[PDB]
Design an enzyme around this catalytic site. Structure first.
Site, short mmCIF file in Angstrom:
data_model
loop_
_atom_site.label_atom_id
_atom_site.label_comp_id
_atom_site.label_asym_id
_atom_site.label_seq_id
_atom_site.Cartn_x
_atom_site.Cartn_y
_atom_site.Cartn_z
N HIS A 133 0.69 -1.18 0.05
CA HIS A 133 -0.01 0.00 0.11
C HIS A 133 0.81 1.09 -0.10
O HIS A 133 0.33 2.18 -0.13
CB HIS A 133 -1.04 0.00 0.92
CG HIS A 133 -0.37 0.27 2.57
ND1 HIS A 133 0.36 1.22 2.92
CD2 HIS A 133 -0.45 -0.68 3.44
CE1 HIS A 133 0.71 1.17 4.15
NE2 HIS A 133 0.39 -0.04 4.56
N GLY A 149 4.22 5.74 10.96
CA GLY A 149 5.36 5.74 10.33
C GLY A 149 6.03 4.39 10.78
O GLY A 149 7.20 4.20 10.34
N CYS A 197 4.76 1.22 10.02
CA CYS A 197 4.51 0.26 8.61
C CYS A 197 5.79 -0.17 7.82
O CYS A 197 6.70 0.63 7.82
CB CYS A 197 3.50 1.10 7.68
SG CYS A 197 1.84 1.04 8.16
#
Lengths: 284, 288
Positions: A39, A131, A133
């Site tokens: 993503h 932040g 991910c």
């Protein structure tokens, strides 16, 4: 009895920053491939958004060094960016998928910079209480890093959801901004028993009693207090702790049932029953 | 909210094994010096009444076997500074991070890299208890550290296990924390107390949760009179000043949070939640 994370050095040397347009997250750099949540390129249509992407749309940074992306590809929900340089810090590693109730360490990272490390369990509802991910979870077995998790999303209850390193989700979640929630979670019974064996090994024996139970009668008691059912394989994995301590598993189940109804009025200096140590963790 | 340890890589590259006779423990390899507990020169019998001056004068450099993974490091000098042995080696550690040595105060937190025979085994987040012990988990010479801006501040080295299962050790200049000694005496950790300023910092961290607040306030003295009945450390004006920032971001005055804590100790959590009041996050930790 302290929860311990694996030493994170071997994983620290693999963390990088991946930026696609205005989105930045963490990536995992092994040999000449960087792995990250797909993503990063974002009801999305991933095969279409990626065809519209070129290598020049990706910016990979290992500390100061910009790595040049020379190929991109997708495997389930993980994006694979082939780069111009092989990570000289690549450890011996394998990609593995773990089961609910198993434990691992997460190296929490922000924009490619490792921040901290903690021990996790994969909950029975397939989420993690953690932040960031792109941060990964892992176990270490004699120099070999087994990567088992990559962080993709936060659920509204505040728990975390992600994939294995082959991009397969843990739990009934998808990498979209739709409405999703963790199921009703459960306590990891086999881990509680392992932790009770740890208490005995550490000389805390007050919760032991003279009684034993039946696997079926405990499971009826366990289901009532929101505990995962215990299986014969669970009894077999607890075997070595039953031999070292001399307390049989259904004997320890009797103890657990009594604790679940009367309280501790105390066990390894804890109040609740800890369920994020596996039988393997306790032996170790 | 997890208790997180610092990434341990910068310390892993400094761990070595130190062997003297039949005793082997961990050492810390920084530049061309290896630091380890001086009781590496003791043979268990010696631990009852060790005379370190006499035991050490009898050693030569080649009595100390230092191994960094595969490589054996050549010891070319040795020296004792308080309770740590400092072994000068022929090679400066290529993986030496930016570092410094700091001595911490009870209530301060840090990570420990637990090691066995020079090889890192696991890492965990710690607080120095008010009784100057560590509730931690062959591990002698393992070190505790903080990392700020790629600089590793070493603050602890493990030396002794106490009879209650807790651990005692020194700073990296060899000065013990608390009244403990590197001698096998009947010595024990005094009754331990809760780190009040850390509990309050954590409550400030809790505050999108505020079910535990109330409409009361308290004087500092009344709070301390109550809290000490639960074996809580006295709260000082310094502690009040430390919580100032967290008091602002939340809008809750420190003594108002103190009133909440007083009621939480009186009531418990009423089945809600951790079911424990947590005291191993510092005000500095909470902000970060």
């Amino acid at each position: 009895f302290r929860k311990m994370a694996f030493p994170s050095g071997k994983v620290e040397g693999c963390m990088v920053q991946v930026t696609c347009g205005t989105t930045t997250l963490n990536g995992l750099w092994l040999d000449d491939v960087v792995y990250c949540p797909r993503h990063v390129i974002c009801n999305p249509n991933y095969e279409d958004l990626l065809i519209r992407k070129s290598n020049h749309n990706f910016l990979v940074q290992a500390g100061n060094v910009q790595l040049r992306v020379i190929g991109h590809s997708m495997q389930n929900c993980v994006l694979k960016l082939k780069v111009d340089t092989a990570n000289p810090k690549t450890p011996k590693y394998k990609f593995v998928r773990i089961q609910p109730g198993q434990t691992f360490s997460v190296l929490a990272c922000y924009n490619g910079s490792p921040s901290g490390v903690y021990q996790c369990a994969m909950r029975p509802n397939f989420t993690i209480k953690g932040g960031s991910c792109g941060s990964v979870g892992f176990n270490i077995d004699y120099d070999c890093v087994s990567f088992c998790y990559m962080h993709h999303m936060e659920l509204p209850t505040g728990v975390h959801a992600g994939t294995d390193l082959e991009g397969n989700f843990y739990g009934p979640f998808v990498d979209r901004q739709t409405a999703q929630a963790a199921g009703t979670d459960t306590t990891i019974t086999v881990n509680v028993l392992a932790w009770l064996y740890a208490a005995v090994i550490n000389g805390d024996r007050w919760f032991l009693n003279r009684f034993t139970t039946t696997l079926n009668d405990f499971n009826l008691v366990a289901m009532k207090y929101n505990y995962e059912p215990l299986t014969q394989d669970h009894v077999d994995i607890l075997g070595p702790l039953s031999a070292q301590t001399g307390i049989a598993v259904l004997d320890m189940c009797a103890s657990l049932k009594e604790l679940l109804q009367n309280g501790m009025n105390t066990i390894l200096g804890s109040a609740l029953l800890e369920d994020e140590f596996t039988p393997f963790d306790v032996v170790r």
